[PDB]
Design a binder for these strands. Structure first.
Lengths: 146, 171, 257
RNA sequence: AAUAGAAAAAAGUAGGUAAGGGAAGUCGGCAAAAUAGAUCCGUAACUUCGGGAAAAGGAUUGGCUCUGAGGACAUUAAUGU
RNA sequence: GGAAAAACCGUAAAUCCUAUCUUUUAAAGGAAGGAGAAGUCGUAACAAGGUUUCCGUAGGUGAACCUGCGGAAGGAUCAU
RNA sequence: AUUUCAAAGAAUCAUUCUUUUUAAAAUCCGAUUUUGUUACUUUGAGUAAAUUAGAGUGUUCAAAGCAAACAGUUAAAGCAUUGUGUUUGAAUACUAUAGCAUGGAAUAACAAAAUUGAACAAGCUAAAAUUUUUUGUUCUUAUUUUGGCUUAGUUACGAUU
RNA sequence: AACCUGGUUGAUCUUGCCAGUAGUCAUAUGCUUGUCUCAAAGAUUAAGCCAUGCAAGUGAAAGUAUAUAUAUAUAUAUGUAGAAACUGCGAACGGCUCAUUAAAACAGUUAUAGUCUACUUGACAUUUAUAAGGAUAACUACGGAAAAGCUGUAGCUAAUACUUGCAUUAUCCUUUUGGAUAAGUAUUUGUUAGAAGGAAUUAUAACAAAGAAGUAACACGUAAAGUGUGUAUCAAUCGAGUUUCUGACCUAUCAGCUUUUGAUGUUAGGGUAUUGGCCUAACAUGGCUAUGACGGGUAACGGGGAAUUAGAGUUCGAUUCCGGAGAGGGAGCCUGAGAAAUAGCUACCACAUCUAAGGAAGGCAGCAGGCGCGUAAAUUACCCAAUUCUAAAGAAGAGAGG
């Protein structure tokens, strides 16, 4: 496909003198998507074809913003227990996640992210699975079991 | 310098205590140039020694087509895919595009075929152009400021074409 | 600065030291190496607080300068040398050999071993690594390297190990029927035959353990030290053999001396 | 241009310039000096909310050698003039 | 090989000019609140308190207050 | 509001606890064993001591402490075949409200959701594999099998009040 | 121990407060004190100031002694001690205070496949030799300065200080024989192959290039053949840095914040011990916000916990343990494995001491003790016997500790 960036697309570990792409098992009952296996895409922060380690905790959240370059913001929604009244209250937390060129995620999709290697200042997690989902209420106001 | 004092995840101004510790750095850039070799040894934590190249000249350059590498003089620094500063000043880093003399490679090809190990699909026309003028574009593959060297590979095929076009005519 | 904190305080010590509130402000901090600090006892505790062969730490020092004491059948030069989860103390003059084990109460006891079994110990491998030249090396709980280790031995297997030549004699493969000894769980210092070994991807691993009294309890795979086969314990387990007693049974027994 | 020349002091008139202090001057800072162009920042009391405002208060500005941004035409996305 | 000395970036204390915010704290005069003594002046409210009361509101008034406008009874009428 | 009610036995004091069996789909030798997610709950794992609850233990009692106890005028005894004290004790639990594993039939949530969907049989077809096949860097063709895709039929076929 | 009385009135029931009443390992104080056991004790107020003293050194088989002493045999032979000094290693701990800090620090819980690791422990190495190269201290002498942990010459001389430097294994042919061929541990690049882990661009194996550093020119001594100290790589271990999730007191008379000065992302590099806007350039225009962001307050170090608890709770947590922070204020380095150390160093500001008037040196929130502050708090005591720590680690040190 077309090029448009100022960097050569290495896709490290590809190899070029052995007879005729790179991707890995990813594990934990998970597997590469069809667009990972057959796609032309190049990245280094992609979990499938990058060197980023799919280590640590794996959680589900809801995508609230999808408009950064290959990067998503997921809200993790929860009920916080209040001991004093012996009652619960609604609470939530935002997790910045890499999105992959594999996944064309949309608002209110559930996403299964992993802890992985910290990428930068804010961004530290990465999507491993996109579970497609529809909610017509505005994302900032939405509560789900994720 | 390193660590804490940058803005909060909220955008807030975080108040700082816990004074700067030894394990928190901020240390000088490499500025290796083109000229008769000079490197200074740097002492890192644990007495781990690093090499800060200040001048360089002959690196180890790898011929992709046969997968072999030889130590070779660099003729010039010619292009940088980032800033205009590095290339104008002729200061070289692992991004940089330099030019090497083709005689080790030319000799090796003569040794293998008898005119200019084992059979492949052999020399490419872009590689042939570079060899023909005796002066060959190459990409540095090592970090001079850390390793003391700017060893590299001759820049090949699609990467060569893309950068050759990007480098140019307008210039 | 903010470097290596050298000392150890009294109630900063692990529980099974038994260095009481009175009688001192500090505990000895172990020398590095043979086993982890938290999974060790020094010679001082054994000689003074358990065996009672010294009045003071100074009397321990007097014992240690004299060269009659041997650990792993080899002379050791300091009081803070660690005696680990399991190893052999030999006292030449009395001709005594003790092997160190955890008791059912969860504290370290030196259990008398004879000459014949003294020449070997049974050693759980913590890791088995492939080093250059296509050469295996095992890494043991007691901090020994075994080069040339048999390739079908695996990373939770135990191994019978000579102590003069350092050669491996045999190995005991970890399986669902294996006799196992618990290192440090809630089930600490006790033995069973394994009901099931349970493996799950990218997480801590569980073993279900069956008792000599034929009761069942859970324990983590990480802290369980293979110790025999369903035929027999391979080493000499303590005289009360890891057995569970209830609180009610224990007090009823306590009165029934 | 209702004149020229020579000499060059006072004094005059139109101008300049002046150490150190800085309105102690006088009717009054009058006179004179300081400020001043652009670009970038920053801008209060108060206010009929429009203003105040170029407020106040700062910074930058030469010469050279480079880099980037901003057109027009014609060959099926790239390549040309 | 090599000391002093200089120069350049990069850290960067401190000093000074402002700018904003914080804290007490001054100030003539203005204008408040409470405490004390059987002080001066009315007689306002309490009963139909001798003009039913109270609300909202505005204007007057040395005041306590009065008057207008529209409400309510917490009315002195819950009754042709 | 709404979706799988129950039945019979055995144990046991008229009572109580328990076990067996009653549709469907997949799998293994006509019999055998599996079947949404989360909240909630059960057990667990792993978990600083001091403190705290709390056991053992007459510090002169108690506050305390973590010690002690037994017999012997120096042996009876145990065990080595004249040598050698002994029993011991220094427990157990609380140890987030979260994370980790874990049994769960109720209760809650959520999930797919006929302005049309998916379960099967049939025929065509391109992907991968099987079987075939000469010549000591390496080479033609062919039957077949498995999954994917287009099209007529066939299910108790497919929407709670 | 799951608990109440007196007070509106002429008298009453109600609302409602006030008052009593009890506790406080919570402070102060008044009076009184025959005993004994037990023993908190200059936090709240000034992280204010400090007189004098003391608080970290280290040599018993194992670096260096023609200062010297000494036991045998006889100014000689052996030897054995040895003031002293170079060298080595420690002083990064422990002690002290709680000023600063409000999603940071702290607590549980991850992750480190993103890393470093001295002592200690176990594995165990690859491209002139009966012993090499000098140069330096103490030391000898002349000196210099009022003072000071100031130091100058010249001649020396050692080291385990400093610098050089001396096969053999495996593949192919041949009988447990004889020939031929190769041979760099980390570290780095380019090319492939690919025992383990849930996951590998990992272990590992090969190729082509570079490439540190190295593998003892050292000391004791096991029948009435042993050991120490040193050494590359690897692992272990004592640890440490980062890093995941979850958890805050009061405040809206604090509602929009952040973004030219990296805020948020992407790319490329540099830097780092390593990930990382950590730092530079180029390119995007994001990101965070009533679940109270952003400010502001707190007499706010955090936890284990403490007080009162019938059950909830409520108040409190300088203050024996764990973790953090700090060493007059700020800041910066050096050394070393480990320090942004503080009885390390440098500088500025705030203080301040001796001066010979040139100059020079100083830092109690270590232990006493003093001043000031105050409502408020002890001795310049004695000792290393125990508890432990550090060293050339027994035998010595330690106002740690008793």
């Amino acid at each position: 496909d077309v090029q448009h960036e100022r960097a050569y697309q290495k896709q490290e570990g590809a190899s070029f003198f052995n007879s005729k792409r790179y991707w890995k098992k990813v594990g934990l009952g998970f597997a590469t998507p069809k667009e990972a296996k057959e796609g032309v895409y190049v990245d280094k922060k992609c979990p499938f074809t990058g060197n980023v380690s799919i280590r640590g905790r794996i959680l589900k959240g809801m995508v609230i913003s999808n408009k950064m370059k290959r990067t998503i913001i997921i809200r993790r929604n929860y009920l916080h227990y209040v001991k004093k009244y012996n009652r619960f209250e609604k609470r939530h937390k935002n997790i910045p996640c890499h999105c992959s060129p594999c996944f064309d995620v949309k608002e209110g999709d559930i996403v299964t992210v992993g802890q992985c290697r910290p990428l930068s200042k804010t961004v530290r997690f990465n999507v491993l699975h996109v579970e497609k989902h529809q909610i017509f209420g505005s994302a900032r106001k939405q509560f789900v079991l994720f | 310098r390193d660590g804490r004092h940058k803005l909060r995840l909220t955008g807030g101004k975080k108040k700082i205590h816990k004074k700067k510790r030894k394990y928190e750095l901020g240390r000088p850039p490499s500025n290796t140039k083109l000229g008769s070799r000079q490197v200074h040894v740097v002492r890192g934590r644990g007495r781990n020694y690093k090499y800060r190249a200040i001048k360089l000249d002959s690196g180890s350059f790898s011929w992709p087509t046969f997968g072999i590498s030889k130590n070779t003089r660099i003729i010039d620094v010619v292009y940088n895919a980032s800033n205009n500063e590095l290339v104008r000043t002729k200061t070289l880093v692992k991004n940089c595009i330099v030019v090497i003399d083709s005689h080790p490679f030319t000799t090796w090809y003569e040794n293998t075929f008898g005119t200019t190990i084992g059979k492949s699909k052999n020399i490419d026309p872009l590689l042939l152009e570079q060899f023909k003028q005796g002066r060959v574009l190459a990409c540095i593959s090592s970090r001079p400021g850390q390793c003391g060297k700017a060893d590299g590979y001759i820049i090949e095929g699609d990467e060569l074409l893309f950068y050759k076009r990007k480098m140019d005519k307008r210039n | 600065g903010k470097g290596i904190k050298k000392h150890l305080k009294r109630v900063n010590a692990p529980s099974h030291w038994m260095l009481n509130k009175m009688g001192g402000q500090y505990a000895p901090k172990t020398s590095s190496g043979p086993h982890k600090l938290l999974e060790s006892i020094p010679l001082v505790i054994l000689l003074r607080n358990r065996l009672k062969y010294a009045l003071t730490f100074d009397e321990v020092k007097m014992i240690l300068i004299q060269k009659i004491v041997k650990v792993d059948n080899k002379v050791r030069t300091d009081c803070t040398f660690p005696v680990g989860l399991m190893d052999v103390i030999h006292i030449t003059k009395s001709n005594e050999y003790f092997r160190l084990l955890y008791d059912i109460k969860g504290r370290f006891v030196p259990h008398r071993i004879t000459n014949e079994e003294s020449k070997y110990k049974l050693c759980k491998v913590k890791k088995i690594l492939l080093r250059k030249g296509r050469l295996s090396i095992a890494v043991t709980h007691d901090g020994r390297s075994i080069p040339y280790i048999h390739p079908d031995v695996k990373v939770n297997d135990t191994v019978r190990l000579d102590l003069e030549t350092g050669k491996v004699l045999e190995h005991l493969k970890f399986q669902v029927g294996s006799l196992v000894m618990v290192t440090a769980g809630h089930s600490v210092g006790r033995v069973g035959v394994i009901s099931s070994i349970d493996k799950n991807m990218g997480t801590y691993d569980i073993i279900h353990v069956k008792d000599s009294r034929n009761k069942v309890f859970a324990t983590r795979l990480s802290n369980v030290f293979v110790i025999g086969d369903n035929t027999k314990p391979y080493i000499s387990l303590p005289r009360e053999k890891g057995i569970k007693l209830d609180i009610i049974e224990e007090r009823r027994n306590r009165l029934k001396a």
